[PDB]
Paper text:
To verify the preferred molecule at the ‘AMP binding site’, PH0208-WT, PH0208-C135S and PH0208-D204N were crystallized in the presence of both AMP and GMP. In the presence of both the potential ligands, AMP outcompete GMP and binds to the ‘AMP binding site’ utilizing the similar set of amino acid while GMP binds to the ‘GMP binding loop’. During crystallization, even a higher concentration of GMP (4.5 mM) as compared to AMP (1.5 mM) could not aid GMP to occupy the ‘AMP binding site’. This further indicates a higher affinity of AMP at the ‘AMP binding site’. Evidently, when both AMP and GMP were made available, AMP binds to the ‘AMP binding site’ with a higher preference than GMP, while GMP occupies the ‘GMP binding loop’ only. Binding of GMP to the ‘GMP binding loop’ involves very few interactions which predominantly includes only the guanosine base ring of the GMP molecule. Thus, it might also be possible that the binding of GMP to the ‘GMP binding loop’ is an outcome of crystallization artifact. Both, AMP and GMP bind to PH0208 protein even after the mutation of the catalytic residues (PH0208-C135S and PH0208-D204N) at the active site pocket.
In summary, our study demonstrates that PH0208 protein would function as a purine nucleotide dependent R15Pi enzyme and not as a homologue of the regulatory subunit of eIF2B. In NMP degradation pathway, R15Pi catalyzes the conversion of ribose-1,5-bisphosphate (R15P, substrate) into ribulose-1,5-bisphosphate (RuBP, product) in an adenosine 5′-monophosphate (AMP)-dependent manner. AMP acts as an activator of R15Pi and in its absence the enzymatic activity has been found to decline dramatically. Monomer of PH0208 protein consists of an N-terminal α-helical domain (residues 1–122) and a C-terminal α-β-α sandwich domain (residues 123–324).
Numbering used by the authors:
A (entry chain A), B (entry chain B), C (entry chain C), D (entry chain C), E (entry chain A), F (entry chain B): 3 to 324
Write the structure that this text describes.
Amino acid sequence: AMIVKEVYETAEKIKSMEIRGAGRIARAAAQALMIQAEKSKAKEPEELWNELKVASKILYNTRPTAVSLPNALRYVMHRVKAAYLGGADLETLRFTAINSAKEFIYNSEKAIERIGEIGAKRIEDGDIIMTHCHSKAAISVMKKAFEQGKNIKVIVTETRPKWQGKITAKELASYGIPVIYIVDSAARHYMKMTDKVVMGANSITANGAVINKIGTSLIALTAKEHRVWVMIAAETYKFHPATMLGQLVEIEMRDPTEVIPEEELRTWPKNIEVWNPAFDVTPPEYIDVIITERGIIPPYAAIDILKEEFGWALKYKEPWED
Amino acid sequence: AMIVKEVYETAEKIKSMEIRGAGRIARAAAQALMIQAEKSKAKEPEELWNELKVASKILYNTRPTAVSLPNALRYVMHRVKAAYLGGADLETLRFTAINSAKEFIYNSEKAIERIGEIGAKRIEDGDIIMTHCHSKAAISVMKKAFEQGKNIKVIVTETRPKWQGKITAKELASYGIPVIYIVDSAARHYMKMTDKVVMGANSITANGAVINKIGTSLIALTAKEHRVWVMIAAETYKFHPATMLGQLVEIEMRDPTEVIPEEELRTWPKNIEVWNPAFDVTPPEYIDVIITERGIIPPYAAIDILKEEFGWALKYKEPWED
Amino acid sequence: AMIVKEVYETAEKIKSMEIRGAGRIARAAAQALMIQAEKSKAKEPEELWNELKVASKILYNTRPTAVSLPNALRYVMHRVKAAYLGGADLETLRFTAINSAKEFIYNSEKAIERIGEIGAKRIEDGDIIMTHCHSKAAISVMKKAFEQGKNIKVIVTETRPKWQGKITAKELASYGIPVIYIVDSAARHYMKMTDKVVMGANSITANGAVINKIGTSLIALTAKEHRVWVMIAAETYKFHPATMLGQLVEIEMRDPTEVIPEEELRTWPKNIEVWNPAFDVTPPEYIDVIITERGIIPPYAAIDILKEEFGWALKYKEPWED
Amino acid sequence: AMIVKEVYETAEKIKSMEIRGAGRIARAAAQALMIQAEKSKAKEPEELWNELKVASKILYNTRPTAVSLPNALRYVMHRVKAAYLGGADLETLRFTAINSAKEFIYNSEKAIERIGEIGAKRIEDGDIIMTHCHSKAAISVMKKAFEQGKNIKVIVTETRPKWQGKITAKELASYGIPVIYIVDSAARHYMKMTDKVVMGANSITANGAVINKIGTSLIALTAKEHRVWVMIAAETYKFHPATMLGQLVEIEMRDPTEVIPEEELRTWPKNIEVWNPAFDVTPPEYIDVIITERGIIPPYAAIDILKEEFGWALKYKEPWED
Amino acid sequence: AMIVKEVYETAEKIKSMEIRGAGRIARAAAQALMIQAEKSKAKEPEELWNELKVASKILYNTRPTAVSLPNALRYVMHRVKAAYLGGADLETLRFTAINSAKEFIYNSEKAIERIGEIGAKRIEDGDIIMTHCHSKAAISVMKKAFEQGKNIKVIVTETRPKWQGKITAKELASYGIPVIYIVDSAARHYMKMTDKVVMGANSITANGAVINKIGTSLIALTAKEHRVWVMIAAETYKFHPATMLGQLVEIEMRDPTEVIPEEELRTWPKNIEVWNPAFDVTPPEYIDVIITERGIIPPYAAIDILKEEFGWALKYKEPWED
Amino acid sequence: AMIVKEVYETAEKIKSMEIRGAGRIARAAAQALMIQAEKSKAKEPEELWNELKVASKILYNTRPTAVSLPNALRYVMHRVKAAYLGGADLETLRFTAINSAKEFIYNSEKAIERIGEIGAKRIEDGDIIMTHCHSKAAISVMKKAFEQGKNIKVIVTETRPKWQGKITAKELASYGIPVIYIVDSAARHYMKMTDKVVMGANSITANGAVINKIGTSLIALTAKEHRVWVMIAAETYKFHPATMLGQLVEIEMRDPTEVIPEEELRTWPKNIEVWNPAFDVTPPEYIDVIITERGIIPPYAAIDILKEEFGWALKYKEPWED
Ligand SMILES: Nc1ncnc2c1ncn2[C@@H]1O[C@H](COP(=O)(O)O)[C@@H](O)[C@H]1O
Ligand SMILES: O=P(O)(O)OC[C@H]1O[C@H](OP(=O)(O)O)[C@H](O)[C@@H]1O
Ligand SMILES: O=P(O)(O)OC[C@H]1O[C@H](OP(=O)(O)O)[C@H](O)[C@@H]1O
Ligand SMILES: O=P(O)(O)OC[C@H]1O[C@H](OP(=O)(O)O)[C@H](O)[C@@H]1O
Ligand SMILES: O=P(O)(O)OC[C@H]1O[C@H](OP(=O)(O)O)[C@H](O)[C@@H]1O
Ligand SMILES: O=P(O)(O)OC[C@H]1O[C@H](OP(=O)(O)O)[C@H](O)[C@@H]1O
Ligand SMILES: [K+]
Ligand SMILES: [K+]
Ligand SMILES: [K+]
């Protein structure tokens, strides 16, 4: 019940997308549980255990679609839970939580560097790469390919409604990479000059489907139409455990004013509904490879990544639940 | 040549897209020649003929892609040239121009009505319709189907960068028609609930391809993927004669500042290029029917429309050439 | 208002499908018009005119999907009407109706044997041909090719619910053509051994789509999948003039007792709805050729059959109307 | 050689399809093995062993296509065999056979209700689901989802020739699920209004293909065409171990009298062959997921189900062999 | 019966492909009938008529697949036949034949220049064009595009068995055009760098299929897979009249030694058959446009080219027949 | 290092393709290391280790694409390196090399046999099989299916530029198997009569793509178009480990003079470039099954083969690196 302010501020900052990107919100959430355990004034283990459960619930209940976030929380709290239930005293608990969270953060950072190097071998000198939204994993691949001296150009899609495309373009251009910026609508038109597509992921399902930023399934579709390789750069913690047992992933519907600003929308008629899905779902048939920190897989090998990292936990409850 | 200010002003408003839409700019160019003819101070028929040629060229060099405009100019000018060359006197030439421009304007208005009556028959009670940009021809269909008492909803795509979807959404709402407004990236995600696609055209080619607002081809692609009928509402003067003899249609590239506003765009590094094609091309295999004022055709019958109405002219030079 | 029993008997027999097959029902309506004229006790030209308009409406309100039937009634009534409006006396009108029926009925027979001759040229020695329902035009093709000494075998799908495939199997076998009889569900399984598919049509639209017995579109889809030629054998009076101006064809829904017999259906619970559609719609992209009495066309040239033989009549009302 | 009548009665009832459905026949063969052990008048361990090998062969030679049946006989006989070869006395062997049957039979029941639970998670409120034949695993899915309070409707294809769709329709309606009953030919026509397809399996191969009731592959093809999820609900004992080493599955050809009744068939000429295939084969590319009792897989992970649970046994001979 | 040697020598030279290419053999055949009429020693018209029939039969019976050849013969002999049957005297016949043949030859030459100019507008600066075999029509397009200053490169396929690819490569390279020469097998591999495909035709059917050099259908297929425009450059006399009435085009099977030289094949075992089809058939769905001397058409407009140039003659016998 | 002439001679014969075929060159490289080890005059184990490393590199730098060769070298050298580093004396090192090379050679021969026994089960009585190049693995399948008494015919493609089809045709004929020999361009034209496609592989990637003789991808493309099973017969040592970590396979570009002989080629102008890729890449969606010595897999299960047998090594440098 004695939740420190950094937990609430991180939760809010995930909700408002001031902190965004599936990897980042997962690291931020691990960091929040880390600080809760740093600054906790609890005396008993039972007390700190209970603070960490509640912090974890607050953080889970921010944004639903990227399983990166629950997987972060799980990574920390499977360990914290095993400690507490094994009889660890206060400081043995405090450290288990803090250290588990530090592990996840470090492993996330290393995973992304690694995805960069693996994916870059798939990029060739002269390539024109089209990307969508702003994905650290995808940018790692493109950045690495450029540092290897491959002379590349990236077609960056603006990525409505929230313009993540702007971030992507200034970022790649600041590393020296030539950028071509277009609207989402122009993806087919420019698919004819594109050699490779590199996008990220928020959740990957057991059958190989990729839930990523709205628009992704379209770029994928047309890439298939033209035989351009769709490469999804994604850490293993993007893979979605509960899809193993039949769960559909929730698609986050965000506020209509991200599309039509409040000052404008209030003046619009009542029979207009504005629908603002945050993600769509791309089928495995439109994906060439998924580049994980453990290597290149075909998208249908997602079930293998999950069988072996994740499946064990599905017979238990979540490690923050009563 | 002494060109009236209405010609210059029309030309600027077409360039700037204050006046926009394929059919409307064609009416605005007819109108402009009408007014050059009305307000002319010419004494000799050669002097007026010269004014009409120069005005025609000013209007021609506004926007390239939509062939409606050239076709409107031709409709007036073939007739003006036949009179002048057949020895018409000043007033008979003036009236030929005025009256030809009027006929085109009236024919365009009636054709749009007829297109609506025709396309509406293919809309069924309960249909969810997806559209793109703001096409008067497409809208005529939706408007008439609603007026027949069919309960429809229209999914309207915002149509970046110039946001024509806003015009379409407000217009359909004003007639009583519920709208679902979405970003362009969401067209595949909502194709699964869509019963019909209805878009316009700027130019249609001899092989049946449809040049229309940027992103049209994406929507038609995923429509096909999903077996949703793609219906293109379009006047005969949208069909492109020069394509009969192999001409490719120029795709208008518009200012970067429509995509990114000038204030923001001047802050960006020089190795980001903003590219803003205003149209793409949708191949005939992704189009179910074209709905013209003379009936439903498959897209490959575009050559028939071109043969029977515009082929005759391709042996002659352009009717405004001096 | 004095309508002869034969008109009523034909109508009732078209409704119960005792008279069936798109061509046959058309000939039966023409026959009925002919007999209404032959047996008329009408003493005035206006009195006969009124009997024929009324017989036409009775006949038109039997089965809606096959345009063959109304195109037959048209052929006659356009001619009856031009006579009546030109001032024709009684026996001139009676004869115009008698000799218009005769003409259509004889032209139907000639068209069907000519489709035989043309279609048989696309059947090759050794061919295995799959068909569906019982189409006289399809059968003419197959029977002619067997008479050219080509060793063929026909796969006859049983064609639920009304078992028309039994008629086809006994018919083709009676000519000495070996038949393979299968359930409809088995059409994909046998498509691998099939060389050609030959089916009939109830109506063909302006854009090339073919409305024919329920199932036809599935057989056509898997035929496309396997690159087996789908050939549609159809008289020019199967082409649907109203589709030129956007009309959709109504799909006859027939009695659920044709699917589940009345004795058994009455015992079933109300929360099972039985839906019996008599036709489906096959898109033009899955049709290699339509074989008409005037030649082979790609399905997209359906609009030409229509433009050249039927379009004239769409500016007038139906010839049996007040 | 002293085989108890129940074994003979089960075999005859699997042959006539009085006992049918891949799971049920498997449980029935296990039940029969169990009763052969219970009622055996055998005084030696070698005498019982020999009765069970012989009962197994009788049961295996009933219907070939569904691997479920031999995987059941295996489950038991592998265990009977290891006992017998380990030196087991009589009542130890009798019990090993009794308790292996029991185990398989109970595990079949648990597997089928677990597929219910997992599969139901992919059904969404409002869904219209098409199915085919009568599959207990498919039905468990649909029934569980209805018990979660999701308003669904099921389209039941009648499933010629043996009319299994009648069993499915009455079953689902008995649980209060509204049903739409249609002929098989109508599956493309209704695919446009279908949200999900759920079908069972008789055998699933190493590369993902699904052998199931004749028709299944057509429904799957048009489902793919329309981007409707095709979900296969199947116990792990439907997976076919011999396909790992290249074996193809035999397609049972059943009596032509199931298609044309004997009373009518005898009147037909000899040059009509009636071919009644009980199953077809659906390729993996047209299957979105297999739902097993252990999870959701892409169809290409069938080889893992097999590698991990069955492959061990392929270096030995069949457990009922000499 | 008094056939001059140039007729026999041309026939033989067509048979051996010393004269080849569909246009060329058509011109050569017209030329042969021209010389027969130059050097004829006939006295009566009836005598010369009879020489021209027999010359025509000799020339027709050379190579079967390119309808260019019969259409040449027809063009000359429809005119010669009308003259003779109208009562023309010897010299009026002699000139009719000679002049008709001179017309065809000139019109063929002009048609090809014209196809060149039309097709070249479809070629863009920088384009890499893949072609197949050696087609004058296709080369006209590429040559013209290069003379317009478009900087192009052509991928020339070797075109087994007869190596026409060598001719094509030396020809284009002698005009200054950069050539990349590859084997037929590499067409897919290099389809990714190709912007346009330009091939010729031997016969074009009523439904839009293109019979062209063996291999054409493959290049077309993969071009569709990659969305590369397939442009077929072809004169109207390549279009095939009798396909209007159901005729399949014969595919010429040429001597096995063109594949395996005689010195080698004689040593090969008896159970090896060498099959050497000269042409395959490409479906209309894989063709973007057909470029005729009358302009760009979609391939399904082939029936229109035939309806209007050719259909009239199909109610008559050939103009060389008794 | 004193390298025996057998190493140098093997290396030259691999380069020149005197010894060719993916599997054979791998055996020839094992063999060559065997012989370096047998005939070595080394006194110290370090001196032999050095010889084995240098020989390994000479053999590695022969031909790049087929990963069988590197894998054979690795099989021997991992084991040689473990011995040398574990302190083996001269003779124990010599024998480790000799014996490792022998095991690889024996395993390769047995694997090819097993592949035949496995693939043959998927060949049915009456099958027409199309193959490409000369693959011992594919041939083992065809040979065994014939020996099982299945009546097969094989369509053999000539496989330019090096004409490996000649080897395949003579070899299959010599076993009794009828052959149809065709040029590569005719593969689509004969796909319509083909029941099965059976080819080999040089390298198979982590995502399931198959690098095989130039034109393989074309044949698989049209096979897919036609629903003909594409089966790839291939040993586990054809699977490519470095692709697990993103490596793309180099495609061997061979001398222009294989395509055009040197005598002819020196006469050609310098602006013709002959390009001779020896392989292409066939994507996994066009492959039905890969038949390895351990069973049938779908192509996407290539990652499983790579994980379970070769992944372990990718953390270590190459076992011949100094
Ligand atoms: N050089 C290469 N090395 C490894 N994999 C490749 C290479 N080139 C293409 N691929 C893969 O093989 C397939 C070829 O696809 P496409 O580029 O459509 O021909 C894709 O699945 C790629 O991931
Ligand atoms: O983890 P990284 O690769 O950085 O981004 C992965 C994905 O998460 C983001 O979602 P949002 O912007 O938070 O909704 C984008 O959809 C992006 O592709
Ligand atoms: O003639 P209507 O149907 O109104 O418009 C047709 C098309 O012209 C417009 O172009 P723009 O907005 O002027 O660039 C849009 O592309 C629209 O679909
Ligand atoms: O195991 P469950 O899911 O009940 O049924 C599986 C399958 O078995 C049935 O076969 P048949 O009626 O025995 O020929 C049907 O093909 C059904 O899909
Ligand atoms: O008329 P042009 O365009 O020159 O050639 C047309 C076609 O005829 C040739 O046949 P062949 O070499 O005579 O069998 C080639 O197939 C070529 O594409
Ligand atoms: O191992 P096996 O099955 O014999 O051969 C496999 C493949 O290797 C060969 O390459 P090349 O002829 O050496 O360039 C061919 O591509 C062939 O299909
Ligand atoms: K591209
Ligand atoms: K390309
Ligand atoms: K085939």
